[PDB]
Amino acid sequence: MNFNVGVDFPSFIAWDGTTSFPVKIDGFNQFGFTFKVIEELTADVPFNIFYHEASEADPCVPGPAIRVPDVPFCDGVATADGLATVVIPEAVAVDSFCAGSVPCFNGPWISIAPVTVNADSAKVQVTVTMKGATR
Amino acid sequence: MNFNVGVDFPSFIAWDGTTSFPVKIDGFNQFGFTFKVIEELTADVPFNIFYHEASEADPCVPGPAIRVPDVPFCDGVATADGLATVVIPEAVAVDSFCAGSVPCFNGPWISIAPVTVNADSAKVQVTVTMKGATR
């Protein structure tokens, strides 16, 4: 039997290959990204993770982007600058996907965008999924 | 705590606003659509739901598009012509999303596209969410 999974685990676009979209995570209590590759890559593509806060002019519109800080785990060492980053390796096949998520929440808005906008960046897609809702 | 949902419930883009992308539902056992608006509409926008078979010349590539048939529910009636369809009403605000799914699987690939490619259809975004895998 098939289910209406979208009722419980909605999905929102975050990076369609040409533009980024802030995603509101305030109503939910978990989330995670999902990367897909549509063409053969030419070099490693790094990604930056940002978070926003409610604007003063409107309490339902994101403000400017604030870069997410790092959070070292019990094993391993902190990043060179203590800021989160994501790197898609060269070996990713066109018919596979990746998954990763941040350890901490921070503000109620999140976003993701590549470090550099080039032809290699246009070959990637990023999407965000939500866990159970709180309202 | 944050759970990294993307491992268990991957989500894929289906209609970014200017192009339709086939999604391979074969590897999973449930799925569902999710609709979101980015700008106000002017009239109801209908969507067509297809399924694709494996390509004859290459088993790893999707074949031609085939319209999904309707299955009457336990207590209702079939559509005008027995084919599944969806309509996004006018009352939908920008800060809202809609979810729905088909009752039967059919082919291994699925797809969705608007009936028309006018300016209204470009304001909607669609993605597909998958439930636990089987491989």
Partner: peptide, 27 residues
Amino acid sequence: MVSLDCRNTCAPAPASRLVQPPCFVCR
């Protein structure tokens, strides 16, 4: 710092890597 998890592929092998068998030993 984030650790990515990736599946081998959506299909086990979209183009199955069917390979020749080892050549037969000498006479």
